[PDB]
Ligand binder design. Structure first.
Ligand code: CU
Ligand code: CU
Length: 438
């Protein structure tokens, strides 16, 4: 069961080409307590600028940290803030404009686990509480390469092999029993439709217990789940003796941005094995029923804002806007109070996992979703099981409209927070804008 080692005291971290180094260990999982103080210094050991982003964290833009605060090689940057996020699985990764995709892909990506009273639900990290960070790489000669062509910058860079926690053909030797699996899409662009199945047997139901920003009100059994870049989904499964497989099952990738898609070595919608679970012996049963940290009801919006996701020529845009490299402080959108955002993805487009920094989002409704998505919805608002928890990254399919509500807390007025697609090629391509809180 190869998973990232834990790091209790993350006071110092170095950004290296192979990933974050702290205490001699690469990309360790930073575990924190809701309410505790974080204080750590980032040192840039790269040959280019960089900055760490605490994905999904409620912090000020200085501790976000905003792309404009990126540091040069040799410099350091200090983060100091109180952890006010709910128990959940978050991430820490690079955010320098134009260089994020490569740094991320070459190795810079770690997990941030926030714990609170009773959040471990009886599971032990590294034993039966397993984070599965799924990523893909394009191997040439057995080594990963990141050489996106202009067309791949438009569509997203897809690898020809999928890894779990940095391991190719990932295999887990487990004992029979209950397992909490923290599914994390750590890929640059690849979308997954995840299912757990008994080898040459049936699909194993997964009980979804948490997403990006924490626990759901109650567990929700699902058979498959879409997981786009940066989305997180924690599920509980009961494994008996035998062989189980974490797989990608068939779906329509909907690459309609430039005709109908390009030739791929490992088709996004093809069936393939992500990880193998060799379950042998009798292990511990961990009863899960009550999740004691429900998500709050969404607030009442006083203003509706429409967002159009479109490809303008060779430039991905949001309401026609895109990042201004010459002015990283440009205020694309001025917001205040509680707003309802209607995010509409063009038909001649591709799925985009939109992510908002600094403020979590409540998913209100999905409309005009493709059938493969509509069939998975569990309420009359077209919402998916993952849409039922508080989120920070949501997938919007071509032709689909996803409505979300966000509380732009007045406490953060005067600060800038990025709103962008988490497909890293799109992000580096400029599909990111600043949200200015007023
Ligand atoms: Cu973020
Ligand atoms: Cu995108």
């Amino acid at each position: 069961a190869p998973v990232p080692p834990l790091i209790k005291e993350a006071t110092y971290i170095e950004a290296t080409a192979s990933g974050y180094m702290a205490e001699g260990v690469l990309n360790p999982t930073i575990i924190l307590r809701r309410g505790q103080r974080v204080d750590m210094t980032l040192k840039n050991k790269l040959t280019e600028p960089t900055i760490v982003h605490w994905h999904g964290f409620d912090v000020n833009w200085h501790n976000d940290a905003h792309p404009s605060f990126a540091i040069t090689p040799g410099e350091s940057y200090n983060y100091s803030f109180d952890v006010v996020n709910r128990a959940g699985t978050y991430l820490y990764h690079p955010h320098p404009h134009g260089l994020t995709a490569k740094q991320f892909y070459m190795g810079q990506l770690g997990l941030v686990i926030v714990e609170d009273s009773g959040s471990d639900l009886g599971f032990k990290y590294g034993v039966n509480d397993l984070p599965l960070v799924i990523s893909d790489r394009r191997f040439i000669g057995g080594a990963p390469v990141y050489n996106p062509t202009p067309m791949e910058m438009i569509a997203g860079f897809l690898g020809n092999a999928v890894l779990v926690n940095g391991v190719k053909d990932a295999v887990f030797k487990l004992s029979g029993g209950s397992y909490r699996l923290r599914l994390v899409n750590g890929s640059n662009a690849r979308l997954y439709m995840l299912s757990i199945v008994k080898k040459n047997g049936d699909v194993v139901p997964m009980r979804l217990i948490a997403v990006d920003q924490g626990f759901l009100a109650r567990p929700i059994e699902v058979r498959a789940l879409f997981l786009a870049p940066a989305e997180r989904a924690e599920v509980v499964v009961e494994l008996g003796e035998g062989v189980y497989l974490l797989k990608n099952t068939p779906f329509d990738p909907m690459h309609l941005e430039m005709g109908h898609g390009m030739q791929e070595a490992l088709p996004e919608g093809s069936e393939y094995t992500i990880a193998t679970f060799l379950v042998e012996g009798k292990g511990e049963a961990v009863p899960v029923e009550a999740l004691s940290d429900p998500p709050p009801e969404p607030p009442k919006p006083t203003r509706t804002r429409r967002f159009a996701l479109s490809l303008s020529g060779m430039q991905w845009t949001i309401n026609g806007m895109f990042w201004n490299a010459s002015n990283p402080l440009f205020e694309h959108v001025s917001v205040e109070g509680v707003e309802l955002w209607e995010i509409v993805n063009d038909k001649a487009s591709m799925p985009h996992p939109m992510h908002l920094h600094g403020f979590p989002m409540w998913i209100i409704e999905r409309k005009d979703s493709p059938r493969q998505v509509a069939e998975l919805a569990v309420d009359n608002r077209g919402r998916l099981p993952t849409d039922l928890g508080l989120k920070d990254t949501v997938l919007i399919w071509p032709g689909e409209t996803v409505k979300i509500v966000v509380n732009f807390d007045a406490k953060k007025r005067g600060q800038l927070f990025p709103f962008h697609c988490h497909n890293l090629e799109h992000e580096d391509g400029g599909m990111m804008i600043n949200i200015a809180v007023k």
